[PDB]
């Protein structure tokens, strides 16, 4: 049940990372870093908010901020080198 | 509800177990624990002279609620016992022969 908790917590942020990536490949047309970082200073704030909201809920899920955090402490049913 | 009998003894021994356990998990520093356990003991020894059923039941459910107030978030469980962390790590599989379902193979 802790594996259920952990993976479904991560999957919540995986959904928003897929949303953000579908915004990436339509605003910039590209998934490469070298094009996106070359052209990111031209797109206005009302779109980059929409991108990085999704790509921050994706990190807020796995890097365990407060919105969902109860999979870290519910991951101690695995052993200690894990 | 009833005087000296097994039905009152089993109750008050259960409540005494719970009153020591719900202070075992509650503090560190064993000196303070064995102090506190001696005065919990004195609370049970002091009031155990009740001669009516009614005030016995009154103190009884009052200390049931007093014991119900000081409950702890996680009781100290030994790990091989079902609150613990060693519980059911590798349960040995039961020895069973293969029950077969198909005439043909396998």
């Amino acid at each position: 049940k802790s594996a259920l908790s952990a993976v479904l917590m991560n999957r919540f942020g995986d959904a928003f990372f897929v949303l953000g990536l579908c915004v990436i490949a339509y605003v910039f047309g590209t998934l490469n870093y070298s094009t996106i970082f070359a052209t990111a200073y031209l797109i206005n704030t009302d779109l980059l908010v929409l991108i990085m909201l999704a790509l921050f809920i994706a990190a807020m899920a796995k890097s365990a901020q407060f919105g969902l955090h109860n999979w870290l402490t519910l991951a101690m049913e695995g052993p200690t080198p894990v | 509800p009833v005087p000296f009998s097994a039905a009152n003894k089993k109750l008050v021994t259960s409540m005494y177990r719970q009153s020591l356990k719900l202070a075992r998990n509650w503090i560190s520093n064993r000196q303070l624990f064995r102090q506190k356990a001696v005065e919990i003991r004195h609370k049970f020894d002091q009031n155990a002279q009740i001669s009516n059923p009614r005030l016995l039941a009154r103190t009884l459910d009052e200390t049931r609620a007093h014991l119900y107030e000081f409950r702890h978030p996680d009781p100290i469980v030994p790990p091989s016992f079902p609150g613990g962390t060693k519980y059911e790590r590798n349960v040995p599989p039961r020895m069973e022969k293969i029950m077969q379902h198909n005439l043909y193979e396998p």
Binding site: - | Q100, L103, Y104, E105
Partner: protein, 48 residues
Amino acid sequence: LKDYYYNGRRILWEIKREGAEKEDWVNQMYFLYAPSLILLLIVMVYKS
């Protein structure tokens, strides 16, 4: 003869044990299904 083979295989040549006794389907699934199904991958790669 089919029943006398397979019933005796289930309860108990009978009294041996070696592997693996070739089945009925493995001749035309490893030698016709699988190579045509590999040839399909080869043609899909080089038609790309």
